[PDB]
């Protein structure tokens, strides 16, 4: 049933620009850093992991966090309170069975009360003016996958793995739109696993080329090479599991020929 694919790809393309957070909001945060943020998403990764949440829920949560921190300065002692509410809202939006509020208080080993979670929820909904249906790298990757002849279990999993790695480092990834990170991750996934490159069919669909993705490829390829040495390791651990065909175990190309 592919009668709406293009109307949707176009609509998400419009929204990803309207939902995108401020590229250099961190520089303006007086108390928090990218490093602290990295620790936050890394933690949300294992939290989504402990509760069996959708990867789509992880990406939403990060989108909400970055958008909230785009207009609100937060003290280092509250960053986790924001990330918890953002995760709860993502689950209430995306999950069939969202873990209840107590689970979310518990995972903070009572760093906050149920009251604080609920109020932060209210606050975040306001700051985001209830605009929660944001496009994500996951929504684009899932679409780029239909252009694979034939489907390739490993390519998909590697693409998702790379896409997730980008959630962790605001620098440099906050300067790319989700649809673009998705293209870079799919190409790099594809190339690594099969030797193939960004499909002819996707240039037509997206209008992106290796040339337009190159700036992002370069970065993602680097993150990929340095992945084993990164301070945050919950995504790699995660992608070692059979559920993702242990792709995080695959060896990244020395170069991309570009």
């Amino acid at each position: 049933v592919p009668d709406y694919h293009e109307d949707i790809h176009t609509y998400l393309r419009e929204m990803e620009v309207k939902c995108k957070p401020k590229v250099g909001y961190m520089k303006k945060q007086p108390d928090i850093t990218n490093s602290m943020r990295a620790i936050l998403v890394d933690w949300l990764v294992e939290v989504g992991e402990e509760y069996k949440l959708q990867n789509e829920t992880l990406h939403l949560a990060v989108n909400y966090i970055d958008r909230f921190l785009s207009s609100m300065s937060v003290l280092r002692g509250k960053l986790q309170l924001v990330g918890t509410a953002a995760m709860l809202l993502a689950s209430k939006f995306e999950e069939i069975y969202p873990p209840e509020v107590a689970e979310f208080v518990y995972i903070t080993d009572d760093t906050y009360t149920k009251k604080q979670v609920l109020r932060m929820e209210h606050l975040v909904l306001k700051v985001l003016t209830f605009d929660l249906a944001a496009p994500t790298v996951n929504q684009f990757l899932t679409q780029y996958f239909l252009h694979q002849q034939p489907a390739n279990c490993k390519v998909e999993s590697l693409a998702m793995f790379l896409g997730e790695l980008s959630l962790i480092d605001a620098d440099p990834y906050l300067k790319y739109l989700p649809s673009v990170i998705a293209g870079a991750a799919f190409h790099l996934a594809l190339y690594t696993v099969t030797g193939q490159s960004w499909p002819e069919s996707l240039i037509r669909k997206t209008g992106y080329t290796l040339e337009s993705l190159k700036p992002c490829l370069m970065d993602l390829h680097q993150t990929y090479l340095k992945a084993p040495q990164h301070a945050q390791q919950s995504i790699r651990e995660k992608y070692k599991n059979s559920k993702y065909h242990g792709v995080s175990l695959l060896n990244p190309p020395e170069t991309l020929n570009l």
Binding site: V1, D7, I8, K92, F93, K115, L118, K126, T142
Partner: protein, 296 residues
């Protein structure tokens, strides 16, 4: 909240109600749907989270308009455009005289527009029924109650099964297909189209198995020929009685040849072959459509 003058209760939300009210300063008549919060519970209901975010994303003449969200710590008020009545009620008020094809055609046409819009924006309504459709004195009809709605992805992944009112629920949900999409909203519309004509629910079962059988006895028990994949579905049973397909002119006799063609396409078993709202808009059945007016 100060500038509102409540006029009269109108319906019932599950965490509130819906009141007719009139903006004191602008004179605008509105519909207020209050949602109960109260801290120390579970926070804002996920059904409201979805309803509000998705609805804000749906600006169209055939989708009720959400004018504002009055957010308070104790409760949450949704301000909507006002409409005089809903389709069930109106159908009853006509129960003795019938709904004129012009109106039936116009309403279906509009409804297909609102849905094509929802689907064009990756939104599944998932609870289309005559009570959730509103009509005003101008010939307008609109989708309301986006409480069971959800944003979907391309391709779709497994979503909630406990979905769609039984009478308007599609076979792929009743049979447990692990993936269902936009076609389920079309099924609902075909049932409503049928319902507007004859005046009585097309498949009024009272249990899932009874709902299926009532479906099988009209369109025939499905097989691998008609719908590749049935015999393999989760809730399919080889013991199912094999009923023969009932020729379509008997399902909704008052229907012209175009109506039959359109309805038959909206009730296709195989969800990959059942017509989309977009395509349906071009169907010959609408060549003479107009925006008549209700009968109130």
């Amino acid at each position: 909240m100060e500038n509102f003058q409540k006029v009269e209760k109108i319906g019932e939300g599950t965490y509130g109600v819906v009141y007719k009210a009139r903006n004191k300063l602008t004179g605008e008549v509105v519909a207020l749907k209050k949602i109960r919060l109260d801290t120390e519970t579970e926070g804002v209901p996920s059904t409201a989270i979805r309803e509000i975010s998705l609805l804000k994303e749906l600006n169209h003449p055939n989708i009720v308009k959400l004018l504002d969200v009055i957010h308070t710590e104790n409760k949450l008020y949704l301000v909507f455009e006002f409409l005089h009545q809903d389709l069930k009620k109106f159908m009853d008020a006509s129960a003795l005289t019938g709904i004129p094809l012009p109106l039936i055609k116009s309403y279906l046409f509009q409804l297909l527009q609102g849905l094509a819009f929802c689907h064009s924006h990756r939104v599944l309504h998932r609870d289309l029924k005559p009570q959730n459709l509103l009509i005003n004195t101008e010939g307008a009809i609109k989708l309301a109650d986006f409480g069971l709605a959800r944003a979907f992805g391309v391709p779709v992944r497994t979503y909630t099964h406990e979905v769609v009112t039984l009478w308007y629920r599609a076979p792929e949900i009743l049979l447990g297909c692990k993936y269902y999409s936009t076609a389920v909203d079309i099924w609902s519309l075909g049932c409503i189209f049928a319902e507007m004509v004859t005046r009585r629910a097309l498949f009024p079962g009272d249990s899932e198995i009874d709902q299926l059988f009532r479906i099988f006895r009209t369109l025939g028990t499905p097989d691998e020929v008609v719908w590749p994949g049935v015999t393999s579905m989760p809730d399919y049973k080889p013991s199912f009685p094999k009923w023969a397909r009932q020729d379509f002119s008997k399902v909704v006799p008052p229907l012209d040849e175009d109506g039959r063609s359109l309805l038959s396409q909206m009730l296709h078993y195989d969800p990959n072959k059942r017509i989309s709202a977009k395509a349906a808009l071009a169907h010959p059945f609408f060549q003479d459509v107009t925006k008549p007016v209700p009968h109130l």
